[PDB]
mmCIF file of C-alpha atoms and ligand atoms in Angstrom:
data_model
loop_
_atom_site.group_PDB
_atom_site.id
_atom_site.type_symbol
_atom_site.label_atom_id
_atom_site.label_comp_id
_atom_site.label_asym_id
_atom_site.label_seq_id
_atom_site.Cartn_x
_atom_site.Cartn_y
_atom_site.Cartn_z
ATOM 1 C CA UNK A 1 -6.101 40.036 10.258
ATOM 2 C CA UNK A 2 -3.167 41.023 12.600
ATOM 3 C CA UNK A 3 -0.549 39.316 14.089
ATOM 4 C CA UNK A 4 -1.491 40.355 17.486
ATOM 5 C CA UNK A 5 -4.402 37.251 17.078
ATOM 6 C CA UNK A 6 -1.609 34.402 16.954
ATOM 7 C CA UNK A 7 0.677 33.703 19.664
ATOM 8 C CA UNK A 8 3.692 32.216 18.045
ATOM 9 C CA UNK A 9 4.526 29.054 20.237
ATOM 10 C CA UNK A 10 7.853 28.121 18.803
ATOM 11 C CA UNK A 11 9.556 27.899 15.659
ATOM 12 C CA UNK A 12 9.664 24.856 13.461
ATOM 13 C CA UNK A 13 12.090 25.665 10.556
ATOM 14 C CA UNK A 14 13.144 27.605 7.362
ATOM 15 C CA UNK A 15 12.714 27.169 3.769
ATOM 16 C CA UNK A 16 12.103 28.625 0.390
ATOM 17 C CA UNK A 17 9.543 31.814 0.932
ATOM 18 C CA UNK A 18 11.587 31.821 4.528
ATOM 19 C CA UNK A 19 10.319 31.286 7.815
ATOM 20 C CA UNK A 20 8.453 28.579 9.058
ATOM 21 C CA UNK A 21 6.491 28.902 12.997
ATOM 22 C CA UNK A 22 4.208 26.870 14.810
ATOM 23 C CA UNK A 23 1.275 28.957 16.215
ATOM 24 C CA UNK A 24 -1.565 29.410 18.183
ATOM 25 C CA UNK A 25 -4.726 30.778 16.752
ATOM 26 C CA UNK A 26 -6.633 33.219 20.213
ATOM 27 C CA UNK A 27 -9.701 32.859 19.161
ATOM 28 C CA UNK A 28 -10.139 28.889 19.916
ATOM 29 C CA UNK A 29 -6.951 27.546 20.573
ATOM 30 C CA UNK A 30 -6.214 26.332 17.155
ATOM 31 C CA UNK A 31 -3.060 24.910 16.541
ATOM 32 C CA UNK A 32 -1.777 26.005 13.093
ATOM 33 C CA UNK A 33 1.851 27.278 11.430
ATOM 34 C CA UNK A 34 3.008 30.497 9.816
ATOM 35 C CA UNK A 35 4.833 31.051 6.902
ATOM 36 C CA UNK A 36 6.867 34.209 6.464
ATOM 37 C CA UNK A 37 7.660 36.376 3.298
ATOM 38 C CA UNK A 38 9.459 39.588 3.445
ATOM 39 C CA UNK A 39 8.447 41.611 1.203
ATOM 40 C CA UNK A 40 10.413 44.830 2.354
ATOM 41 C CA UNK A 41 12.879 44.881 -0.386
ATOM 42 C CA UNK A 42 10.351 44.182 -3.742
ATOM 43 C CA UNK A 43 8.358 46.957 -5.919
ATOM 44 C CA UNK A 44 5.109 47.725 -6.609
ATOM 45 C CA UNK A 45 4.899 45.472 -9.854
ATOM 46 C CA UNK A 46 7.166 43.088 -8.386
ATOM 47 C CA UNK A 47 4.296 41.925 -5.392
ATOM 48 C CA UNK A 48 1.782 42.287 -8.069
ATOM 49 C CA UNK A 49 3.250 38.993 -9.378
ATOM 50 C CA UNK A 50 2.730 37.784 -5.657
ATOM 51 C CA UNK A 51 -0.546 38.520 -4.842
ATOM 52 C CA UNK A 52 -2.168 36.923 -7.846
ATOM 53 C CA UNK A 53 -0.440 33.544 -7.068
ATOM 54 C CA UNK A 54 -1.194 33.721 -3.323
ATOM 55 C CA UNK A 55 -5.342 34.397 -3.995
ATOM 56 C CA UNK A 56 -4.789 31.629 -6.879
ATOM 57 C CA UNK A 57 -3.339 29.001 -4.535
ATOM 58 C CA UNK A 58 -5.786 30.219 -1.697
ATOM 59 C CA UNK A 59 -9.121 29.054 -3.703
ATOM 60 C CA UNK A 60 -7.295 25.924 -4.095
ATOM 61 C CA UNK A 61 -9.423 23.057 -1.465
ATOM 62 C CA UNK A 62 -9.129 19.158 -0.934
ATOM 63 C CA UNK A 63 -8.357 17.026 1.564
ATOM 64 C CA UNK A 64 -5.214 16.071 0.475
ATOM 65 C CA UNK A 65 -3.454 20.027 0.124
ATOM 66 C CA UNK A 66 -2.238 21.908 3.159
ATOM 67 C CA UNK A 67 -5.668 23.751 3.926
ATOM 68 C CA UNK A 68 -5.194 27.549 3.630
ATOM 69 C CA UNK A 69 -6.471 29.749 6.471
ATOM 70 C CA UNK A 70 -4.837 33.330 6.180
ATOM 71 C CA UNK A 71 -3.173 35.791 5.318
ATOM 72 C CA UNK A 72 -1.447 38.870 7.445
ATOM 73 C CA UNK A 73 0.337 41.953 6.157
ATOM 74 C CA UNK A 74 2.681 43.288 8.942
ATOM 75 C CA UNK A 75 3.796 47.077 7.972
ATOM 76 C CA UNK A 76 6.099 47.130 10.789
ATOM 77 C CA UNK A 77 8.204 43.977 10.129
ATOM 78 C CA UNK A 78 7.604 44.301 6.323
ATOM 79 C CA UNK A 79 6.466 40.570 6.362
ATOM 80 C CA UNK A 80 3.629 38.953 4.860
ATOM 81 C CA UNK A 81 2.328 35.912 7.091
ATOM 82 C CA UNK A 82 0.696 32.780 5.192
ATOM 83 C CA UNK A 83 -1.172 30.826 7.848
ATOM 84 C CA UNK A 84 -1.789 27.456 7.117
ATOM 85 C CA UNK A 85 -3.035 23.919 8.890
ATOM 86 C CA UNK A 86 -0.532 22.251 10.602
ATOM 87 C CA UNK A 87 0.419 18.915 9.891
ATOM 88 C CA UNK A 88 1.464 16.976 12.840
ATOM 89 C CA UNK A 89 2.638 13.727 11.081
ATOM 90 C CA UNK A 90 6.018 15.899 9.487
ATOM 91 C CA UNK A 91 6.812 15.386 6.174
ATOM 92 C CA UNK A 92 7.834 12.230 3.313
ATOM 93 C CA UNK A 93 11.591 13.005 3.558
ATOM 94 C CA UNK A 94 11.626 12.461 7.110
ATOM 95 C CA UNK A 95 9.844 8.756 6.571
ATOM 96 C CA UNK A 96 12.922 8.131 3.784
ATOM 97 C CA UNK A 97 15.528 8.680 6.676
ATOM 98 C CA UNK A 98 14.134 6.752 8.796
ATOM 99 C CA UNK A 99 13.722 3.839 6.834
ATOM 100 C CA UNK A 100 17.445 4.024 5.518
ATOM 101 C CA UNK A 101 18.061 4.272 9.029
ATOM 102 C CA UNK A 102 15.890 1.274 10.548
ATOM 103 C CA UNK A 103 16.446 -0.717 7.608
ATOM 104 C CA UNK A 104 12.839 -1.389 6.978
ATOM 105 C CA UNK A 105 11.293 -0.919 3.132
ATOM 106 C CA UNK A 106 8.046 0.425 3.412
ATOM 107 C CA UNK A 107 4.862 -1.755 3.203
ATOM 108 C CA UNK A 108 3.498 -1.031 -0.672
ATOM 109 C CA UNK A 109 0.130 -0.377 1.036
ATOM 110 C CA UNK A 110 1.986 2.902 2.602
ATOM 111 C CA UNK A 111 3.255 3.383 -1.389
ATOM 112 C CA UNK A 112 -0.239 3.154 -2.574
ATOM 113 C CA UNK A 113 -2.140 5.183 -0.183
ATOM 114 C CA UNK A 114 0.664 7.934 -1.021
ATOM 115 C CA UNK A 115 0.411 7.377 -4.551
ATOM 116 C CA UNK A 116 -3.256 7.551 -4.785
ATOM 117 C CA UNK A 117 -3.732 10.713 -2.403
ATOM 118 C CA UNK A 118 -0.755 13.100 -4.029
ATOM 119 C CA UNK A 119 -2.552 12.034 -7.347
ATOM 120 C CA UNK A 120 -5.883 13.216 -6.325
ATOM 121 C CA UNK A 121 -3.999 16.412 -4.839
ATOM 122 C CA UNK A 122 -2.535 17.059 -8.441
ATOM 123 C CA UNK A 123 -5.333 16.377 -10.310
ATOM 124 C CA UNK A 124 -7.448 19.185 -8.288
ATOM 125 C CA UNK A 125 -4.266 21.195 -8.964
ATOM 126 C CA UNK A 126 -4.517 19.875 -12.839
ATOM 127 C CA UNK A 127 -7.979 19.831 -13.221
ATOM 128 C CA UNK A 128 -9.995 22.347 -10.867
ATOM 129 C CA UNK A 129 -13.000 20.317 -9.857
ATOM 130 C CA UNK A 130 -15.144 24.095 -10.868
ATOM 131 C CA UNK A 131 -13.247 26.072 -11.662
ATOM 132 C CA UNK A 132 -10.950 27.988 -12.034
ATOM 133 C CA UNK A 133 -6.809 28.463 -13.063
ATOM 134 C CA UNK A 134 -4.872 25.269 -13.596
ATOM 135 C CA UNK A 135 -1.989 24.923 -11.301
ATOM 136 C CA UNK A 136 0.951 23.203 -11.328
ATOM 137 C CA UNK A 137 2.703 22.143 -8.304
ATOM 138 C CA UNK A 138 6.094 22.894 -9.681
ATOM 139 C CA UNK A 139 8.466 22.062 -6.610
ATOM 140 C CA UNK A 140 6.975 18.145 -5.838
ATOM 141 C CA UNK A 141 9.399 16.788 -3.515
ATOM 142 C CA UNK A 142 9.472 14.625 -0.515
ATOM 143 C CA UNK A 143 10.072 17.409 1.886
ATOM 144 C CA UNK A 144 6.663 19.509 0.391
ATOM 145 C CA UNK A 145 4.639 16.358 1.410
ATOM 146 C CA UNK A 146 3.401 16.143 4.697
ATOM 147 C CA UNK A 147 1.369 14.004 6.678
ATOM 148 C CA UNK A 148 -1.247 14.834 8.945
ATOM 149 C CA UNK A 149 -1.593 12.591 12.379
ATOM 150 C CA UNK A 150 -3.062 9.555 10.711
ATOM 151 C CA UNK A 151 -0.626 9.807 7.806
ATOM 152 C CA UNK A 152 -2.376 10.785 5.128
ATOM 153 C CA UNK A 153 -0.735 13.202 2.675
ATOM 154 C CA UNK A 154 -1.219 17.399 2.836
ATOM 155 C CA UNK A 155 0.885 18.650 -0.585
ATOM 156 C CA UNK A 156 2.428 21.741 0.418
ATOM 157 C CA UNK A 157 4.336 24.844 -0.337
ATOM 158 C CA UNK A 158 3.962 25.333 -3.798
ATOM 159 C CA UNK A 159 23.340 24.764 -3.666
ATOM 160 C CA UNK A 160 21.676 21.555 -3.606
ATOM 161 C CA UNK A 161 21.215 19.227 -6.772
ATOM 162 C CA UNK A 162 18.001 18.553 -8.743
ATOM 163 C CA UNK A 163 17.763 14.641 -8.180
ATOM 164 C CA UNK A 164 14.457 15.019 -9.771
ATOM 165 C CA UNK A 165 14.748 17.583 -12.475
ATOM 166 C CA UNK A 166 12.803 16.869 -15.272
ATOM 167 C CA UNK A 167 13.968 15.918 -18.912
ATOM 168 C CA UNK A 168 11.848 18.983 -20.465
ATOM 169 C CA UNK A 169 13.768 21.560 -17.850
ATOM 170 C CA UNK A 170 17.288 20.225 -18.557
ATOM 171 C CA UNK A 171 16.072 20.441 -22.476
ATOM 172 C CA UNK A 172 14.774 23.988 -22.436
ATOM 173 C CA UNK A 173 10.919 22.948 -22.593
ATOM 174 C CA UNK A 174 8.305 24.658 -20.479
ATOM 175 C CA UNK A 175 7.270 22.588 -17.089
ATOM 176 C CA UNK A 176 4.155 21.406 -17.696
ATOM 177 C CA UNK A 177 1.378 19.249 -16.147
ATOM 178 C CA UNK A 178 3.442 15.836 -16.880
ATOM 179 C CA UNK A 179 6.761 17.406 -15.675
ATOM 180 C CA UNK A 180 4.611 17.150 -12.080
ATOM 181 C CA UNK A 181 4.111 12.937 -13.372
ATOM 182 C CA UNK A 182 7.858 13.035 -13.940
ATOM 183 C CA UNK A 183 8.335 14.502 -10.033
ATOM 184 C CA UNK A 184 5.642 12.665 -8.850
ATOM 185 C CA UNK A 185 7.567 9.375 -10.266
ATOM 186 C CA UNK A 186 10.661 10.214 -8.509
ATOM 187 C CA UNK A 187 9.352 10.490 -5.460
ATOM 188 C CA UNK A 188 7.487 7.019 -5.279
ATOM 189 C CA UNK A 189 10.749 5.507 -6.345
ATOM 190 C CA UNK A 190 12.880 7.011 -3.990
ATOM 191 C CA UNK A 191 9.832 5.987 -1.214
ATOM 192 C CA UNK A 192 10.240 2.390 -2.571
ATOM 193 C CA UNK A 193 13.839 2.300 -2.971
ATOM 194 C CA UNK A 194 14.954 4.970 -0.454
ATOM 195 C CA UNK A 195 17.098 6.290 -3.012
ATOM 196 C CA UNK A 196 15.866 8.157 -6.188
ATOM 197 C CA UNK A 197 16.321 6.852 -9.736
ATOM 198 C CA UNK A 198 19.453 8.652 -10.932
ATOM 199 C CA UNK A 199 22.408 9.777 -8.366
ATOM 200 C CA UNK A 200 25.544 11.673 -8.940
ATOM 201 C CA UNK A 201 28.164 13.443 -7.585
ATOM 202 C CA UNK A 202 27.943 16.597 -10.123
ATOM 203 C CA UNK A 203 25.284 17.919 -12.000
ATOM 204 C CA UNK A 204 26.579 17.112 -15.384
ATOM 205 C CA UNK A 205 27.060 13.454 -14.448
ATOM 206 C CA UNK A 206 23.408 13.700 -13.371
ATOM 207 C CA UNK A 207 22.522 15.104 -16.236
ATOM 208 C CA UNK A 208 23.961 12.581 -18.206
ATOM 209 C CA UNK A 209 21.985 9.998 -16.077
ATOM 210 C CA UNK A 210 18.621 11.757 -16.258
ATOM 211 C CA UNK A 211 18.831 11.580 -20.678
ATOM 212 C CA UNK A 212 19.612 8.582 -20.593
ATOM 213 C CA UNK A 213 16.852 7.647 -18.670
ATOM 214 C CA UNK A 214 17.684 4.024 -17.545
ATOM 215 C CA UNK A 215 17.995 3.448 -13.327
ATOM 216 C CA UNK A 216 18.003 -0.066 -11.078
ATOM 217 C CA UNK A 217 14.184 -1.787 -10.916
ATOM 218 C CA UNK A 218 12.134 -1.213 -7.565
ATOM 219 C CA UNK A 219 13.050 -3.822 -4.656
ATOM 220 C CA UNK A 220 11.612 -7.199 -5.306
ATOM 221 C CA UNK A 221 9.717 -6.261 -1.898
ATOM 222 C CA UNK A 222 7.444 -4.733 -4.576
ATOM 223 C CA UNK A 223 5.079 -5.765 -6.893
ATOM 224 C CA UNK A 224 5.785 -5.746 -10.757
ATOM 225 C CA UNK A 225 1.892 -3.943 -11.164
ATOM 226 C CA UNK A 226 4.097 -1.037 -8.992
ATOM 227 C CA UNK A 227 7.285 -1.188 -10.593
ATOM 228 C CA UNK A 228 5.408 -0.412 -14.022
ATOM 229 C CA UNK A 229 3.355 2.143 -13.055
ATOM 230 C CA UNK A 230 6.360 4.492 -11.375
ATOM 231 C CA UNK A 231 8.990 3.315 -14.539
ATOM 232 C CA UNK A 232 5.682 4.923 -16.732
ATOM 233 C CA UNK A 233 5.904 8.767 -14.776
ATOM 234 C CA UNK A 234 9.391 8.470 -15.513
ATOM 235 C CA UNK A 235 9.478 8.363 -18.949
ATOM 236 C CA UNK A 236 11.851 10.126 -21.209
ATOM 237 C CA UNK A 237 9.174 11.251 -23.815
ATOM 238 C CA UNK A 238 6.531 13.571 -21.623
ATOM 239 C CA UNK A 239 3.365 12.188 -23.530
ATOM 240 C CA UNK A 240 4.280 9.019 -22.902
ATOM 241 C CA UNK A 241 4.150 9.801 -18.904
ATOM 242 C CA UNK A 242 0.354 8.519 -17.743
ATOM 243 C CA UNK A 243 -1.796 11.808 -16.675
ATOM 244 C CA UNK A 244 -3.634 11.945 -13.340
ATOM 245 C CA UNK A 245 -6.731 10.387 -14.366
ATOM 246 C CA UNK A 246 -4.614 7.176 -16.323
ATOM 247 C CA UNK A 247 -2.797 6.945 -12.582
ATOM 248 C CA UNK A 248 -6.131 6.482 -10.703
ATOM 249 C CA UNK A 249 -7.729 4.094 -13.352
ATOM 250 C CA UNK A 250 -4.550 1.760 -12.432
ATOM 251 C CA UNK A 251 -5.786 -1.903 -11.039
ATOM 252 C CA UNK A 252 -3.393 -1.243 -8.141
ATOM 253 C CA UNK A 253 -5.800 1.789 -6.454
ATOM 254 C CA UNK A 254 -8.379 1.080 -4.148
ATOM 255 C CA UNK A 255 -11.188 2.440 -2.071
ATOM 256 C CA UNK A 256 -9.077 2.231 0.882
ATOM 257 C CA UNK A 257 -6.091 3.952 -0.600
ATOM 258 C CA UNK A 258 -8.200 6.959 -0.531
ATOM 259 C CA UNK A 259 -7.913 7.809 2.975
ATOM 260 C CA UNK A 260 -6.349 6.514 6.354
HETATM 261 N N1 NU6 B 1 9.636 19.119 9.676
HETATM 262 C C1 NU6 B 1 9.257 19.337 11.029
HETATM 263 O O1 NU6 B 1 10.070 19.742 11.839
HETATM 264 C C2 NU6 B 1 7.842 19.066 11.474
HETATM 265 C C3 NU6 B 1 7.589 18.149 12.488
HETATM 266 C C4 NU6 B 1 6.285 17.909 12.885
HETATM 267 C C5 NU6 B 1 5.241 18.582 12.264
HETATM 268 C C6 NU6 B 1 5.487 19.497 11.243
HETATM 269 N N2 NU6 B 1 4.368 20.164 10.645
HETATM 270 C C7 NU6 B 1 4.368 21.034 9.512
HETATM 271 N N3 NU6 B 1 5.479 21.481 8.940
HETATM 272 C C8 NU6 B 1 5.446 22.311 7.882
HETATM 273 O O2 NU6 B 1 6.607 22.784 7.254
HETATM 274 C C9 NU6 B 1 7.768 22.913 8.043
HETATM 275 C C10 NU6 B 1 8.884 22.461 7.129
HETATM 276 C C11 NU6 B 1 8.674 23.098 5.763
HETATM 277 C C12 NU6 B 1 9.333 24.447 5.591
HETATM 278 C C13 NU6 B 1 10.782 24.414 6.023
HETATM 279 C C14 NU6 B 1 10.882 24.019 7.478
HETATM 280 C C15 NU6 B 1 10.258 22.665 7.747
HETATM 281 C C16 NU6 B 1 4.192 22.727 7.335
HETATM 282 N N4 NU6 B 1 3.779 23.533 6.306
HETATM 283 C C17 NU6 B 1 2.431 23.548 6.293
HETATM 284 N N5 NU6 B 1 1.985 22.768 7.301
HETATM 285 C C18 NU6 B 1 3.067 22.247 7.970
HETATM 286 N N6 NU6 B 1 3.182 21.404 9.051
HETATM 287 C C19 NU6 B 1 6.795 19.735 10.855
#
């Protein structure tokens, strides 16, 4: 319930809600991170918006979402502390790099088992299993997918330009549940191609690129049974996106793709 239970063993990085630290739990040794939120400068109603989303994203279980452990308020550094598992296989964005850099595709098996387990991880996000609030990811990126020691996928952490912004957000339309298919599409294609679908240097040009909604074919490395089912999250018209359950029905998906 207190800080004074973790040791803080390094830390890893920072990001959105802020800092990011690698930690060890005292009671058994545990090996877990820390993220950081500073509360010190919001208002009463202000963290009312917060702690609703935190206890809504904390009843949130499977195998495939970073797994929750707890929560720490810290009066003296004004800093609420999310603890979380730690994933020690990094993150997606990290397995882009070095594939541009090696100059190695990935296998489509890779594709599939990441395909099928960040589609199980939305659909419990989309569909709680019983039951409770629906909740969309809302920032589904490679960076917020890691990968545990066997590579499997943990979804995480519900200047720079929107490659993947979504034709409904640049059109004034609420994000909904198929705005995480449109996300969801980008980041399989840029996993296949190791570039996403529509690049630019500005954000009108992308713009421009993103309604028009046209972008190069998957490598032939991959099979046309893939290149279909990534072309359908990325869809212009939302309803025409496939939903979670039409992903997992695909021909493509197997027992095996389930889990490393
Ligand atoms: N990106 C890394 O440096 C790295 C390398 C090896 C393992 C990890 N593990 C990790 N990493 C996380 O995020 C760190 C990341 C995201 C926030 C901004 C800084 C970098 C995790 N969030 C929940 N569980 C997490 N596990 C990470």
């Amino acid at each position: 319930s207190r800080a004074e239970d973790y040791e803080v063993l390094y830390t890893i990085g920072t990001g959105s809600y802020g800092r990011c630290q690698k930690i060890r739990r005292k009671s058994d040794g545990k090996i877990l991170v820390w993220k950081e939120l500073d509360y010190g400068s919001m208002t009463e109603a202000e963290k009312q918006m917060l702690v609703s989303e935190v206890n809504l994203l904390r009843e949130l279980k499977h195998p495939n979402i970073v797994r929750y452990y707890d929560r720490i308020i810290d009066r003296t550094n004004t800093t609420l502390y999310i603890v979380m598992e730690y994933c020690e296989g990094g993150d997606l964005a990290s397995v882009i790099t070095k594939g541009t850099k090696e100059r190695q595709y990935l296998d489509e098996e890779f594709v599939l088992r990441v395909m099928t387990q960040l589609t199980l991880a939305l659909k419990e996000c989309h569909r709680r299993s019983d039951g409770g609030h629906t909740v969309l990811h809302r920032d589904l990126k490679p960076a917020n997918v890691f990968l545990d020691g066997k590579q499997n996928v943990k979804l995480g952490d519900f200047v720079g330009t929107p490659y993947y912004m979504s034709p409904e957000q640049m059109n004034r339309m609420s994000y909904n549940e198929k705005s995480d298919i449109w996300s969801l599409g980008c980041l399989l294609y840029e996993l296949c191609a190791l570039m996403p679908p529509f690049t630019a240097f500005s954000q009108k040009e992308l713009a421009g690129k993103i309604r028009e909604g046209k972008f190069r074919r998957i490598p032939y490395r991959y099979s046309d049974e893939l290149n279909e089912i990534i072309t359908r999250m990325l869809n212009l018209k939302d309803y025409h996106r496939p939903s979670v359950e039409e992903i997992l029905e695909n021909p493509l998906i197997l027992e095996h793709h389930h889990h490393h």
